[PDB]
JSON list of C-alpha atoms and ligand atoms in Angstrom, two decimals:
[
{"chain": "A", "resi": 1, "resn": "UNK", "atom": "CA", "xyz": [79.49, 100.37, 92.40]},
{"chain": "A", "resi": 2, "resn": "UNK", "atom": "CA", "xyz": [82.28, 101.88, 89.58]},
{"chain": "A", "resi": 3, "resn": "UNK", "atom": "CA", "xyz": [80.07, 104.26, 88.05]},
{"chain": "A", "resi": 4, "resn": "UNK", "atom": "CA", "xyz": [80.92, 107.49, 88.07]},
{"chain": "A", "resi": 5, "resn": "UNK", "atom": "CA", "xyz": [79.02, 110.74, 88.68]},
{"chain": "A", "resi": 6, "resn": "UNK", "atom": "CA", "xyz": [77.79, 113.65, 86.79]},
{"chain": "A", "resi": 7, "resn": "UNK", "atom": "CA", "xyz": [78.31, 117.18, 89.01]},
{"chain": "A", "resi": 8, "resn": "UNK", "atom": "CA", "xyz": [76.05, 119.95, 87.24]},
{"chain": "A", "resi": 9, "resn": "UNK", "atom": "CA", "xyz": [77.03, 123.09, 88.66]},
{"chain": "A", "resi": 10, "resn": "UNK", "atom": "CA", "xyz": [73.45, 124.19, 87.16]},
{"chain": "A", "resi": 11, "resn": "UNK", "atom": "CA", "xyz": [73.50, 127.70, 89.01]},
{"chain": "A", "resi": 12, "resn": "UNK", "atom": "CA", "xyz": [77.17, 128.26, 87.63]},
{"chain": "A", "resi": 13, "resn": "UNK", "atom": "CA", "xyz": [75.85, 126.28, 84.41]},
{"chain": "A", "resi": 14, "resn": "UNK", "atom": "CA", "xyz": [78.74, 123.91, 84.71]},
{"chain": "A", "resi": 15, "resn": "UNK", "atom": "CA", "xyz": [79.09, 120.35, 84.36]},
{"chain": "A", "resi": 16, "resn": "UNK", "atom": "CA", "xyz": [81.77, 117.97, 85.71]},
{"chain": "A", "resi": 17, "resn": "UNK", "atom": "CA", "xyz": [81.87, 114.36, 85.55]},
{"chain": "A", "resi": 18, "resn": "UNK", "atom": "CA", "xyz": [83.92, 113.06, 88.73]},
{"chain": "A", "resi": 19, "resn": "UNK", "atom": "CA", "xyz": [84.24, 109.40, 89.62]},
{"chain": "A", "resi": 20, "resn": "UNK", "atom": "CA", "xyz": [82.66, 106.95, 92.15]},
{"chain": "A", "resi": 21, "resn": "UNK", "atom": "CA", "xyz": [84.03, 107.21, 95.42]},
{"chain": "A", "resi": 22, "resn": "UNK", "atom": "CA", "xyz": [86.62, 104.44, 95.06]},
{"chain": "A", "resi": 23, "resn": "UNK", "atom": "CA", "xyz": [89.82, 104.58, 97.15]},
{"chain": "A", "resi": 24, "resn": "UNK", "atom": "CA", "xyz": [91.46, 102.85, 99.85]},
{"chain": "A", "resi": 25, "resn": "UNK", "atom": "CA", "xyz": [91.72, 103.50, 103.06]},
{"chain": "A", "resi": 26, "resn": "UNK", "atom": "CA", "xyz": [95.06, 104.52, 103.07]},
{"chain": "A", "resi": 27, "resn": "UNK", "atom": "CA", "xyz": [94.19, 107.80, 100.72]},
{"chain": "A", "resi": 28, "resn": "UNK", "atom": "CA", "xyz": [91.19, 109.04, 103.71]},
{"chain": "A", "resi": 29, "resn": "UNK", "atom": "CA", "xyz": [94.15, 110.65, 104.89]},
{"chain": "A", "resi": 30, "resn": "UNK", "atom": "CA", "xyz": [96.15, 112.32, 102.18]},
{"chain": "A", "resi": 31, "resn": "UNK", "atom": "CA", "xyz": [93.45, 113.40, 100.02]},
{"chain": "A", "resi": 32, "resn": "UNK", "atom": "CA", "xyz": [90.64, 114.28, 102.23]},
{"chain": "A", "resi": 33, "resn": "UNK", "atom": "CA", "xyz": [90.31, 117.46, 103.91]},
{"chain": "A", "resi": 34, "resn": "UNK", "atom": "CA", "xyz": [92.00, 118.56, 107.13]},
{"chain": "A", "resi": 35, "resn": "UNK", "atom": "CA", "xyz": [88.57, 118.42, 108.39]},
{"chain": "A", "resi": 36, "resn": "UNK", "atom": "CA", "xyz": [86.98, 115.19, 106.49]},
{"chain": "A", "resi": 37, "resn": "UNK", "atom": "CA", "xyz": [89.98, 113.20, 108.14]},
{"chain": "A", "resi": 38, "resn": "UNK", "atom": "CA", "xyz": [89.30, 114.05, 112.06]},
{"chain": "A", "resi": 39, "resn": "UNK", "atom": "CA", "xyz": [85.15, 113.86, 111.06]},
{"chain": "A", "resi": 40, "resn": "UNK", "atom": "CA", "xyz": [86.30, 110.74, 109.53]},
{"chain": "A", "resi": 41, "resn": "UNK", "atom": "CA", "xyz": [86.72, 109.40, 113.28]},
{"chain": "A", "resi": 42, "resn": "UNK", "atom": "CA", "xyz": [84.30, 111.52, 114.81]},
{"chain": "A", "resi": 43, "resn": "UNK", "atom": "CA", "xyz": [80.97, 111.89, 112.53]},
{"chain": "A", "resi": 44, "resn": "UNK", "atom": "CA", "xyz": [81.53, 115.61, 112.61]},
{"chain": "A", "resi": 45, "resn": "UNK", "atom": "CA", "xyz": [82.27, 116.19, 116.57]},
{"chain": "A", "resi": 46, "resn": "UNK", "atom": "CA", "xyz": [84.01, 114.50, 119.38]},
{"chain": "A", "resi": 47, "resn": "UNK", "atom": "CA", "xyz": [82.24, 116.75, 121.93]},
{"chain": "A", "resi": 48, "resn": "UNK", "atom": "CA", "xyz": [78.28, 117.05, 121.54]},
{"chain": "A", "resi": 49, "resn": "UNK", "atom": "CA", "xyz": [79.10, 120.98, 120.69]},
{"chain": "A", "resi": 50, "resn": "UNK", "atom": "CA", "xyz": [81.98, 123.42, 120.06]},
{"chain": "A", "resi": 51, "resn": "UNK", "atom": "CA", "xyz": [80.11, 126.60, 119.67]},
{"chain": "A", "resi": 52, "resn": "UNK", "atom": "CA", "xyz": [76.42, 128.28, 118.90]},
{"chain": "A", "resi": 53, "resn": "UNK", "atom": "CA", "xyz": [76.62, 130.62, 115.90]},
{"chain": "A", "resi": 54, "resn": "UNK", "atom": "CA", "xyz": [75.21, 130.21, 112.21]},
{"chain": "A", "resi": 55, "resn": "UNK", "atom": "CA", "xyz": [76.22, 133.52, 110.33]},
{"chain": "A", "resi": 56, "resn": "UNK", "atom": "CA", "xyz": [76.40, 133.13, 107.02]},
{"chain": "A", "resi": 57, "resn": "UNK", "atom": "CA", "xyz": [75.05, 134.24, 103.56]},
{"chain": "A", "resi": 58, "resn": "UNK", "atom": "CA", "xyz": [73.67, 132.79, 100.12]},
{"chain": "A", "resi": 59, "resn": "UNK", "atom": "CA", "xyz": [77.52, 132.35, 99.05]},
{"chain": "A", "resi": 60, "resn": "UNK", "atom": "CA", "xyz": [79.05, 128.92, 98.53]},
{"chain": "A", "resi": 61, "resn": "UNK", "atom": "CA", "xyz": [77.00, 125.45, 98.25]},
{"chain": "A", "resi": 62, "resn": "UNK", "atom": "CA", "xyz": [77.37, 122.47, 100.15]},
{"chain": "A", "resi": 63, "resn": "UNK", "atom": "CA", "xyz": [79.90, 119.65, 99.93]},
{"chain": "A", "resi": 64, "resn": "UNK", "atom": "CA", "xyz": [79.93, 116.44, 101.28]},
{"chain": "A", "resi": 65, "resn": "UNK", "atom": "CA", "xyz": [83.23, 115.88, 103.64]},
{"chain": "A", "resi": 66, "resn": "UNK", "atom": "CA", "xyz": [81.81, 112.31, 103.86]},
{"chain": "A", "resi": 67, "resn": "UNK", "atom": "CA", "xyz": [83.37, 111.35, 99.96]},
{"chain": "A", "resi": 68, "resn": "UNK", "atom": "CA", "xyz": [84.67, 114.71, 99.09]},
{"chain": "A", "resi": 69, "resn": "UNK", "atom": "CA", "xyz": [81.98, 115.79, 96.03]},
{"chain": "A", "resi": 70, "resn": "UNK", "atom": "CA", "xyz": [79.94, 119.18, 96.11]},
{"chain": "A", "resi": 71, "resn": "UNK", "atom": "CA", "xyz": [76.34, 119.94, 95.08]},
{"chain": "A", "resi": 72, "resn": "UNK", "atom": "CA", "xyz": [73.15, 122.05, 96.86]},
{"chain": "A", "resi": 73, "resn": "UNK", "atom": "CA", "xyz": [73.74, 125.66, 95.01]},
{"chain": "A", "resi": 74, "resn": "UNK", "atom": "CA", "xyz": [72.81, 127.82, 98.07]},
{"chain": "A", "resi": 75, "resn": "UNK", "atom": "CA", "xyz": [69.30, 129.00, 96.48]},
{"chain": "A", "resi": 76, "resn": "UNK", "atom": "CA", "xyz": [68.68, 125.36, 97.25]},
{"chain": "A", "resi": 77, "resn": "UNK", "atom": "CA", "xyz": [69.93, 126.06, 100.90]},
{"chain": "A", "resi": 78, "resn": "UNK", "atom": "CA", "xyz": [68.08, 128.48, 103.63]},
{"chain": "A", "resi": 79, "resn": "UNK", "atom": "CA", "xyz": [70.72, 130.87, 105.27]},
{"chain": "A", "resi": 80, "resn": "UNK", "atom": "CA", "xyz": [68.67, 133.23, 106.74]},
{"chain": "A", "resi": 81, "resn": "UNK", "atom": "CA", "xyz": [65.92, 132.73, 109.57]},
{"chain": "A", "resi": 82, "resn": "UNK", "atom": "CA", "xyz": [67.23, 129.46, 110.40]},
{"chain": "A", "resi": 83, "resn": "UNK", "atom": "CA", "xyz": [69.78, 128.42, 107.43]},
{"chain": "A", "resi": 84, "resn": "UNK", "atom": "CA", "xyz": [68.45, 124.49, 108.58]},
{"chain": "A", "resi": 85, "resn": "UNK", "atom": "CA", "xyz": [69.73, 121.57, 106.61]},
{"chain": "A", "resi": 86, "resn": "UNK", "atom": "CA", "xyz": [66.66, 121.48, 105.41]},
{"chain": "A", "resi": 87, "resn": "UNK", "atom": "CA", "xyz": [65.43, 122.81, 101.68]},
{"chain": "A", "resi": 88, "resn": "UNK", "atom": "CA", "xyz": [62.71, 122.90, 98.99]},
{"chain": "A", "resi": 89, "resn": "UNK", "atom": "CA", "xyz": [64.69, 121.94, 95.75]},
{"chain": "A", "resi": 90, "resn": "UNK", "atom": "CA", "xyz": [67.80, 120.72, 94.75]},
{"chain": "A", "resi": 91, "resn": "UNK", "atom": "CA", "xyz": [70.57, 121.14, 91.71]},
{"chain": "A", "resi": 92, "resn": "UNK", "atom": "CA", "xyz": [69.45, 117.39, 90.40]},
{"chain": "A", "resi": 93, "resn": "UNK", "atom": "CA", "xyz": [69.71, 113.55, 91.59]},
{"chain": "A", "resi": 94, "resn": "UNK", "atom": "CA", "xyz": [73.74, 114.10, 90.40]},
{"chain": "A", "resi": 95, "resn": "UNK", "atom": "CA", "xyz": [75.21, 113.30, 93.83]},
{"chain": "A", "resi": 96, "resn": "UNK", "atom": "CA", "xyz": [72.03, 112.60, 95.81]},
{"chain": "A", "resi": 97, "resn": "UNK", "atom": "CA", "xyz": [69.89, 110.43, 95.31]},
{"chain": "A", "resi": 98, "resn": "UNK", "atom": "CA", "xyz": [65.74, 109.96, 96.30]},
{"chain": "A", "resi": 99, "resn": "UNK", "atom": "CA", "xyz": [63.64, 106.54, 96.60]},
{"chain": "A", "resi": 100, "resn": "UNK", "atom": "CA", "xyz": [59.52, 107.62, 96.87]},
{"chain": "A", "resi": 101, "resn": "UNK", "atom": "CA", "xyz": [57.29, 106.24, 99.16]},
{"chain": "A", "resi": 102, "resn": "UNK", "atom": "CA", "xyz": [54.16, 107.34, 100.92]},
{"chain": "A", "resi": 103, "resn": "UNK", "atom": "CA", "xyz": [55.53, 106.84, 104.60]},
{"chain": "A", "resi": 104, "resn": "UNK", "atom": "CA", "xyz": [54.06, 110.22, 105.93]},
{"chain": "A", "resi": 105, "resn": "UNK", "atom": "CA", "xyz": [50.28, 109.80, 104.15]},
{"chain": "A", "resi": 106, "resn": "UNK", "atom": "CA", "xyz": [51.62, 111.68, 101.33]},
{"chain": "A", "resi": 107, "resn": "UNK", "atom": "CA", "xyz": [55.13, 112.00, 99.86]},
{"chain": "A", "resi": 108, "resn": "UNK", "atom": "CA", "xyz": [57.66, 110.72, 101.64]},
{"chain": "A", "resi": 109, "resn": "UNK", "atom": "CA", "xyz": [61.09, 110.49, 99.74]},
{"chain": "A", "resi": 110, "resn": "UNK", "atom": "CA", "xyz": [64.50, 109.03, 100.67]},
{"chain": "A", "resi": 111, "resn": "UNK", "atom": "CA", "xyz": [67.43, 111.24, 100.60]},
{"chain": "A", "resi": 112, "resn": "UNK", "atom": "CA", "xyz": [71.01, 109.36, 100.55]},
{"chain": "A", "resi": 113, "resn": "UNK", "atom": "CA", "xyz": [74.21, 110.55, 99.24]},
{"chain": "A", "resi": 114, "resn": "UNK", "atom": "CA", "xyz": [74.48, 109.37, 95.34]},
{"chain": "A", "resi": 115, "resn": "UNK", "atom": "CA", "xyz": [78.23, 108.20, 95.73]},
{"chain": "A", "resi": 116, "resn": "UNK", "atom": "CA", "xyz": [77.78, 107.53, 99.95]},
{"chain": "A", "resi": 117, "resn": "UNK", "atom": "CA", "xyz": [74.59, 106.53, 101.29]},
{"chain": "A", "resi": 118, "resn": "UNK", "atom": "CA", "xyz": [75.53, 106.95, 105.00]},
{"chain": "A", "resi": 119, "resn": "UNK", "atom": "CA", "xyz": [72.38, 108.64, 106.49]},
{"chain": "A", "resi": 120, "resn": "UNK", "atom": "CA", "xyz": [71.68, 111.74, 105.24]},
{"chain": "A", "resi": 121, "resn": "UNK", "atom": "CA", "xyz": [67.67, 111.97, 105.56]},
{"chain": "A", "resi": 122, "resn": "UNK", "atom": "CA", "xyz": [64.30, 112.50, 103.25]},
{"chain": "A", "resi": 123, "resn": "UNK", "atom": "CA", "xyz": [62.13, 114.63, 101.63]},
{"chain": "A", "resi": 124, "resn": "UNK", "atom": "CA", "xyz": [58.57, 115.26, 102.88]},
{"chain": "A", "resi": 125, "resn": "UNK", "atom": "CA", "xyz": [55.26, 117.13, 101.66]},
{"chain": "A", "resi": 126, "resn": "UNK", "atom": "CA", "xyz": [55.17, 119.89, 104.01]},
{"chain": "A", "resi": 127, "resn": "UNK", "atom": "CA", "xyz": [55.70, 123.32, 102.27]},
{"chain": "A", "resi": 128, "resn": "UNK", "atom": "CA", "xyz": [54.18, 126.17, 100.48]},
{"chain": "A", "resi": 129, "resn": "UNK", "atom": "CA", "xyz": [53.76, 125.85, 96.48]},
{"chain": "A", "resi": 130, "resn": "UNK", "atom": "CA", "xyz": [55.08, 125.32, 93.94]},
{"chain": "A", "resi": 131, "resn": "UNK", "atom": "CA", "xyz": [58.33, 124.14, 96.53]},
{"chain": "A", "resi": 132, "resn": "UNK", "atom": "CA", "xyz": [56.33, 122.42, 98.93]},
{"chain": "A", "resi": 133, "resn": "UNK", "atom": "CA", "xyz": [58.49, 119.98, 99.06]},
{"chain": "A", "resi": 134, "resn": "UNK", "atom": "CA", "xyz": [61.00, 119.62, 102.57]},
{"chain": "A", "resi": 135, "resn": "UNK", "atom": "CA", "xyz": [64.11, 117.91, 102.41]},
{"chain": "A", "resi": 136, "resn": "UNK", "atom": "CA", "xyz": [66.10, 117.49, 105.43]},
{"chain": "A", "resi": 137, "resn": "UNK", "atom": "CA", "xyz": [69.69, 116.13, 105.80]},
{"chain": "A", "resi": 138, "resn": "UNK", "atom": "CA", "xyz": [71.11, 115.32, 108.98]},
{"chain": "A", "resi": 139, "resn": "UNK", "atom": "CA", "xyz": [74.50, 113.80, 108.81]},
{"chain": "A", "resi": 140, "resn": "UNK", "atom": "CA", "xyz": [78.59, 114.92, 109.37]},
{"chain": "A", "resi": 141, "resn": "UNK", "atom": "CA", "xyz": [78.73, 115.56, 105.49]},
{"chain": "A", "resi": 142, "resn": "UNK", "atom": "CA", "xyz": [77.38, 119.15, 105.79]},
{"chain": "A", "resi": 143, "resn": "UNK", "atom": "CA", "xyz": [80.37, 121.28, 105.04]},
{"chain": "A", "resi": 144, "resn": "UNK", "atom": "CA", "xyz": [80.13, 124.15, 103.08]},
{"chain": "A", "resi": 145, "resn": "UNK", "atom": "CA", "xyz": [82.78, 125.16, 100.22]},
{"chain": "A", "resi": 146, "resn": "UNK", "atom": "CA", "xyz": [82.71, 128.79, 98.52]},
{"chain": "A", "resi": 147, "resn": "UNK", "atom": "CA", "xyz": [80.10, 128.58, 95.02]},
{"chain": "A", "resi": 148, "resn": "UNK", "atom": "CA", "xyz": [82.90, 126.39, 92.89]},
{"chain": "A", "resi": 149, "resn": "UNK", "atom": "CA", "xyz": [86.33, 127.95, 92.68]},
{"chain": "A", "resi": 150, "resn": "UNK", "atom": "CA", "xyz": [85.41, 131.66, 92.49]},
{"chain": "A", "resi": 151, "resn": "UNK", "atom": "CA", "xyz": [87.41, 131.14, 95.95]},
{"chain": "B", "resi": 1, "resn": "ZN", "atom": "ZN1", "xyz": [78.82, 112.40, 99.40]}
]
């Protein structure tokens, strides 16, 4: 749909309006990543691993490889412990987007891409207050970016 799409860099207390992902296919491969354009073929990886390592740090926030547009500031990430794709907040319904049900006996919500819907995952009822809430997110779209442009 041609809408367009509010980005609030709300920890950076930015705000950018981008559009819609609407291109053809021909511009996948000019101005996508030299990453998004092999995961473009591959949902993230051709073999079923390339390594075993997660070292990182609250720096950067996610951005979605899978239409190009960034969101989760890292406070709305784990790093540490596990640093799962899996979180207790996010920076708004900008460029993600939630449906509620009930589908666990509690609160089960949708969680789909805002400008791509391609899998993603939900939200669920499941931790400690007041963020109880448990998103998780399991799709190729998961690359990181440092915080905006401060790299
Ligand atoms: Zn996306």
């Amino acid at each position: 749909m041609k809408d367009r799409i509010p980005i609030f860099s709300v920890a950076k207390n930015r705000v950018e309006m981008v559009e819609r992902i609407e291109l053809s296919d021909d511009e996948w491969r000019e101005i996508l990543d030299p990453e998004a354009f092999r995961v473009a073929r591959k949902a993230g990886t051709e073999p079923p691993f390339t390594g075993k390592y997660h070292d990182l740090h609250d720096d950067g926030i996610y951005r979605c490889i899978c239409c190009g547009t960034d969101l989760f500031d890292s406070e709305t990430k784990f790093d540490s412990g596990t640093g799962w794709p899996s979180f207790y907040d996010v920076v708004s319904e900008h460029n993600i987007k939630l449906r509620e049900d009930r589908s666990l006996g509690m609160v089960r919500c949708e969680v789909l891409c805002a400008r791509c819907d391609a899998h993603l995952g939900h939200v669920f009822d499941d931790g400690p207050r007041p963020t109880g809430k448990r998103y998780c997110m399991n799709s190729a779209a998961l690359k990181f970016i440092p915080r905006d442009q401060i790299g």
